[PDB]
């Protein structure tokens with residue numbers, strides 16, 4: 001019924017700001033791919049990402065990762081209004097600051113240890129006011145973008161100068177840290193975890209609905225397995241990805 | 250990269266002030282052997298020792314013992330700046346006082362019971378301001394050198410007169426006593442102990458590094474074996490040789 005067409009999903013393929021979108025319809029939004037696209041968040045936030053094709057993606061939903069999801073303050077199973085517009089405009093020398101408690105990881109040059117490989121050939125569109133994650137050297141850290149000269153967004157190429165700061169600042173507490181564990185930090189591809197998803201979807205992602213309708217949601221759940229098999233991950237990473245408050249007895 | 254070339258290591262061969270140094274390069278420092286050499290400590294301290302050759306020493310590191318190590322306030326795995334200079338100048342009648350609580354071991358003549366065999370044919374170079382250990386008669390004790398006429402150091406021969414004092418004085422508490430147990434006081438040549446070395450090297454000899462890098466050092470370690478097999482030695486002698494504070498529950 002003229003519905004937008006966007007659902008949010010975990011993305012198994014491993015990418016910084018890349019999206020899958022269904023082949024059974026490519027003509028409704030009609031994006032050739034690699035074309036800069038809108039993403040509508042909450043509260044007044046938006047994001048920009050690159051799109052690729054998957055035979056094994058659903059006609060239903062959209063593979064996207066944890067850095068895009070946290071920026072938008074979208075969650076799994078959520079829906080974000082989306083719109084294609086193809087256009088993108090280049091930008092300069094994007095500017096960068098440490099975010100939150102994390103820092104001290106880099107001594108001296110910090111764009112040699114971090115930036116060069118990731119902005120290399122990627123054309124990763126990078127926004128004012130978002131956080132992203134660079135991995136390497138046995139540590140991960142995130143660089144906020146406070147000031148970008150062109151706006152609202154800029155595609156990046158290595159024709160531009162390199163400005164440096166490197167001084168930390170406290171990130172807002174309302175934000176959900178990217179080190180707090182979530183679905184991707186749980187490995188094993190057991191698929192059993194998908195079973196806990198079906199149980200905790202409605203009760204703790206949709207509280208008000210159960211006062212409307214008589215049904216019985218499950219009160220308890222036992223995880224069992226020998227020690228070290230990830231039982232505390234599952235709870236931490238269900239509570240983190242659904243926004244519920246995790247307690248610990 | 251023009252590195253000095255000195256590393257500090259346990260020395261299994263049994264010697265008062267003798268050092269092994271690698272054959273794969275003898276030409277870089279170029280010491281024929283038996284030649285007085287510098288050793289650079291910390292804080293402003295230095296030492297002098299005699300050098301010998303080992304097929305089974307590494308090109309990497311340097312066999313030296315616990316009396317030299319405590320003087321320098323070097324530790325195992327540490328590195329001390331070193332320099333050859335061949336020269337040595339003779340000295341007189343070196344002067345000697347008891348050190349720390351230990352004493353009362355010798356009644357009357359104390360250089361008959363102690364000195365004569367060890368300064369005999371050795372040419373042991375002996376420093377102002379260091380402690381060394383003489384063994385015999387079911388006890389061990391150490392004689393500080395407060396006053397030596399020639400300086401900075403003197404090689405000794407038995408053409409000189411013998412002065413005696415024998416009255417104790419408190420040794421500085423900051424010092425690490427030579428009776429406190431360490432690697433050599435652990436016997437058995439199990440080589441298993443080498444395994445505990447690999448575990449406790451980085452965590453407790455290099456604390457600041459683990460706040461820089463994400464890794465998990467081991468929190469607990471179980472030693473097990475029937476009683477009397479040296480389990481309390483291992484802990485005492487890991488804590489003593491690494492400088493960590495030993496607690497006891």
Ligand SMILES: Nc1ncnc2c1ncn2[C@@H]1O[C@H](COP(=O)(O)OP(=O)(O)O)[C@@H](O)[C@H]1O
Nearest residue numbers: 185186187188225226227228229230231232233
């Ligand atoms: N299946 C898994 N996938 C990814 N990481 C795991 C897995 N199992 C364990 N880990 C890692 O090892 C630890 C497992 O300990 P824990 O979460 O206490 O498991 P349990 O609750 O079963 O004792 C976690 O900190 C996690 O980082």
Ligand SMILES: Nc1ncnc2c1ncn2[C@@H]1O[C@H](COP(=O)(O)OP(=O)(O)O)[C@@H](O)[C@H]1O
Nearest residue numbers: 434435436437474475476477478479480481482
């Ligand atoms: N392998 C060994 N090498 C040298 N000395 C040992 C050894 N095992 C025991 N000893 C000596 O005997 C005692 C062993 O007792 P202890 O250290 O309490 O061992 P455990 O902790 O296994 O009971 C130590 O005081 C030590 O002096």
